[model samples]
Structure formats: C-alpha cells, structure tokens
Target: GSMAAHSADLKCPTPGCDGSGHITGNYASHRSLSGCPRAKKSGLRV
Candidate 1:
C-alpha cells in the first residue's frame, strides 16, 4: 500500500456527490474512493 502525503486533502466540486462535504479531492481520481464508509470513524482515531 502507498502510505504517503498523497492525502494532500481537498474538497470535491461534485454537487450532491457523496463526496460533497464528505471526503474529497481529485479530478483524475474520485472522492468516493477517499470517503470513509465508516460513519463513526473520525475523532475515535483522535
């Protein structure tokens, strides 16, 4: 797996995209891949 700062984060421009306000980034890639399926995943990792 590639664990790099490719995580250079951003917001998706897609309207109503699941990517919208959720995970984001990429025109060559898609935020849907970046968006977490785990709803309760954030802060816990904090």
Candidate 2:
C-alpha cells in the first residue's frame, strides 16, 4: 500500500524518457540513471 506513495517521483534522467523511481514496479527504468550510454543501448525493457 505504501508503494503507491512515491511512484510519481521516479523518472528517467534523460530529458525525454519515461521511468519511475517509486521503489516498486519493474525497476528496469533505474538503468537510465547509471550515466552510461549502454543503459539506453542495452535494450532495457523499461
């Protein structure tokens, strides 16, 4: 239940990507925060 409290804050560092950092969910979006181009190139599902 608490998981829903922080879902909106999560997002991709990329100026134009959709990701989430709510501490729940698939969490695949966190890959974009790594500062590595490969994160976006690795075919991340999120």
Candidate 3:
C-alpha cells in the first residue's frame, strides 16, 4: 500500500511575464520572444 500527495507552483516575479507575480509553473516552461533578463537571478531552477 502507498499514499502520497504532491503539489507545486513556481512562477516568475518579473512583470509582463506569464502570471506575473503569481504562480504559473516554471518560467522555462514558457516560450517568449525576449527571455527573462534576470532568469538566473529569478530563482529559476533547470
């Protein structure tokens, strides 16, 4: 027998991005014309 629960919500705080200032999954998951300038500093994990 097994029981487990998982939940994750990661997002970018930078403005103009998907779900700005909100949890919208990982930033790398989205495709944009101009990638985030502070991606590395944005606390995004690859």
Candidate 4:
C-alpha cells in the first residue's frame, strides 16, 4: 500500500540494467532500445 507514496520514480528491473535513475516502465523497453548499453547487449526482444 505504501508503494504509491514514493511512486514518483520507477526503477529498471532488467538483469543487466540499472534499477536506479532509469525512467518509469523502462525495464520492459530496456531490451528493445539501442541507446542503452545494457539494452544493446540484451538485444531486441521484438
């Protein structure tokens, strides 16, 4: 229930991505995007 209190920032959840300072919902997109170093290595899932 307290999760929404600090919902202002959402962290990444990917194995090779940084969970901090990343954009909200970035975890799901991190694999497709090419700019991010972690994403580059993960490669495009789609």
Candidate 5:
C-alpha cells in the first residue's frame, strides 16, 4: 500500500539526516497517523 512506500521513503527532515526514512507500519490503517509530518505534507520541491 501507499503507507508502505511512504514509510520506506520518509526522511526525518531533522536536518543532516544520513540514514533512511522511518517506518511506522500500516499508518494508512490508523486515523491518528493522519497528521504525521510526511503524511500531511508532500516532498515536492516545487
């Protein structure tokens, strides 16, 4: 699902991040996960 892909690609955005994105798992199935930083926003540069 989208969440899996999202999780796999999500970066911490905390600056100077050298590791892979964080994976919370099945965020698509959880309502509380709706407002997550990466979920609520897009990574599009433009």
Candidate 6:
C-alpha cells in the first residue's frame, strides 16, 4: 500500500509538528499518506 511506502520511519519535518508523522487518508482514487498539513502546506517533501 502507498502508506507503507510513505511511512517507513517517516516523520513530519514541519516545525511544531509535535513529532507527529505521516498520516494516511483516503483519496478519491487511492490511499494517500503524507506529513501533517503544516508540513504539506509548507511544501516540504514528505
């Protein structure tokens, strides 16, 4: 699954992440996993 590939020891790189890592969410076409919104909004590669 994409989550497996996305979360291999992955941790959110965003400042003030509270150590929270990638979160899996259901996308329309497929499952997606990425860092929290802060990291994503910051345009950091997860």
Top-TM-score structure, candidate number: 2
Q: Decide which is better by TM-score, 4 or 6.
A: 4
Can you list the residue pairs that collide in candidate 4?
none
Candidate 1 local distance difference test against the native:
0.33
Q: Residues 1-25, candidate 4, lDDT per residue (tens digit)?
A: 1121122224332345443333444
Write candidate 1's Cα lDDT for 1-46 as tens digits.
Answer: 1221233334222323333333333233334334533224443222
Question: What is each predicted model's overall lDDT from 0 to 1?
Answer: 0.33, 0.39, 0.34, 0.34, 0.32, 0.37
lDDT-wise, the better of 1 and 4 is 4
Q: TM-score of every model? A: 0.17, 0.24, 0.20, 0.22, 0.18, 0.21
Error of 2 at 11 (Å): 0.7
Candidate 5, 1-46: lDDT as tens digits: 1333333535332222212333354343322223233443343221
Clashes (backbone N, CA, C under 3 Å), per candidate, total: 0, 1, 0, 0, 0, 0
Per-residue CA lDDT of candidate 6, range 1-46, in tens? 3333333434333433423434443322222234454444555443
The parts of candidate 6 lying over 4 Å away from their true place are: 1-11, 21-33, 40-46
Better of 1 and 6 by TM-score: 6
RMSD to the true structure for each prediction, in A, is 10.7, 9.3, 11.4, 10.1, 9.2, 7.7
lDDT (Cα, tens digit) per residue for candidate 2, span 14-33:
44334434234434445244
Give the range of the ten consecutive residues with the poorest summed lDDT in model 1.
1-10
Candidate 3 structure, TM-score to reference: 0.20
User: By descending TM-score, how would the candidates be arranged?
Assistant: 2, 4, 6, 3, 5, 1
State, as a TM-score between 0 and 1, how close model 6 is to the true structure: 0.21
Shift of residue 1 alpha carbon in model 5, Å? 22
